[PDB]
Design an enzyme around this catalytic site. Sequence first.
Site, PDB file in Angstrom:
ATOM      1  N   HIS A   1       0.346   4.153  -2.879  1.00  0.00           N
ATOM      2  CA  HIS A   1      -0.198   5.619  -2.396  1.00  0.00           C
ATOM      3  C   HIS A   1       0.927   6.624  -2.810  1.00  0.00           C
ATOM      4  CE1 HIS A   1      -3.829   5.292   0.189  1.00  0.00           C
ATOM      5  NE2 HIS A   1      -3.810   4.591  -0.728  1.00  0.00           N
TER       6      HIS A   1
ATOM      7  N   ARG B   1       1.055  -1.314  -0.064  1.00  0.00           N
ATOM      8  CA  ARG B   1      -0.061  -0.033  -0.040  1.00  0.00           C
ATOM      9  C   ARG B   1       0.836   1.181  -0.012  1.00  0.00           C
ATOM     10  NH1 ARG B   1      -4.431   3.663   3.428  1.00  0.00           N
ATOM     11  NH2 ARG B   1      -6.168   3.295   1.893  1.00  0.00           N
TER      12      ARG B   1
ATOM     13  N   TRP C   1     -10.381  -8.793   3.889  1.00  0.00           N
ATOM     14  CA  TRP C   1     -10.997  -9.084   2.714  1.00  0.00           C
ATOM     15  C   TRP C   1     -11.039 -10.829   2.330  1.00  0.00           C
ATOM     16  CZ3 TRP C   1      -7.503  -4.951   2.723  1.00  0.00           C
ATOM     17  CH2 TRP C   1      -8.356  -3.468   2.188  1.00  0.00           C
TER      18      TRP C   1
ATOM     19  N   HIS D   1      -6.116  -6.209  -2.839  1.00  0.00           N
ATOM     20  CA  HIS D   1      -6.825  -6.073  -1.625  1.00  0.00           C
ATOM     21  C   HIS D   1      -7.359  -7.421  -1.276  1.00  0.00           C
ATOM     22  CE1 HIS D   1      -8.945  -1.750  -1.806  1.00  0.00           C
ATOM     23  NE2 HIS D   1      -7.553  -1.744  -1.476  1.00  0.00           N
TER      24      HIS D   1
END
Length: 291
Positions: free
Chosen positions: A49, A45, A188, A172
């Site tokens: 980002h 992540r 998830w 995810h």
Amino acid sequence: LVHVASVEKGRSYEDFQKVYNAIALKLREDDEYDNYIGYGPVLVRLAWHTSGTWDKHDNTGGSYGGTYRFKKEFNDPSNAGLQNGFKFLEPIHKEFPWISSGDLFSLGGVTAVQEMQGPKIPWRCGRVDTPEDTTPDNGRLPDADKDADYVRTFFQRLNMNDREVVALMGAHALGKTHLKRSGYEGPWGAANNVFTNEFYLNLLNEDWKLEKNDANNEQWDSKSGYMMLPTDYSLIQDPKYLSIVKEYANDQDKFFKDFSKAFEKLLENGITFPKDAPSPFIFKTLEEQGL
Ligand code: HEM
């Protein structure tokens, strides 16, 4: 603005493999983080980002400048929790101070995907740190409460099409949502530190109920203890995204290959590679090296 890739002076594949290995060995060692999830997901992540601020219209943001090191961007509300990935990488950067910040943050993502048994992600060096005033403003990262039209429109700014979007979202499978960081809570799936196509299988196969979490935000929950964000769930509401979800649910190898391409693209958006730049590097995993 043109950002031309400039290789760290004198450095070659073996230098970067050493960096990869230091990140990989730390990943193995620091296993307790986030209730034994480990740092892999937060590193993926972080790479996303730091790259995802890119605007194709003016070449602002993106991975090149390594601007997450500056307060404006590290304090972006959208970035809550990524400080753990940054802290993780600090001793790596101390050992290997010659590496640029953007090269480190993107290489952290690559290393993490590969170590978690994901596909090989070719990676190119040459990001150059740029000054504090080149930090992109907050608000370029996407909201999770929105629909498929939002998602599709959002990712056009990053020059991603439907396939690229659906493929990227398969990250995810990893990690979880943390109520205090994002206003969403839960994993998830079950395999959240191994890179698989589980995100797609779960979308299609779980029995999802639309619920409110303790932050008063809607999310989709299953009795297995899994969740999807509204923007996740939008990939099975929209008939174009749905077809692609089904494809990845049914073909692990195809998901791997498309993910690898889309993730390398994400990581390279904004960067001009000269014609005599080195070829992309494909790093060996620790397992492949017998380390
Ligand atoms: C519509 C686009 C996207 C939205 C709205 C979105 C939203 C979110 C949110 C809300 C979280 C939870 C953060 C937390 O509470 O800790 C999260 C986690 C995560 N996202 Fe995204 N995401 C998107 C796309 C992506 C993409 C493109 C990638 C990478 C390819 C990615 C990788 C991750 C990972 C690995 C986590 C888990 C991090 C952890 O466990 O610390 N996401 N995302």
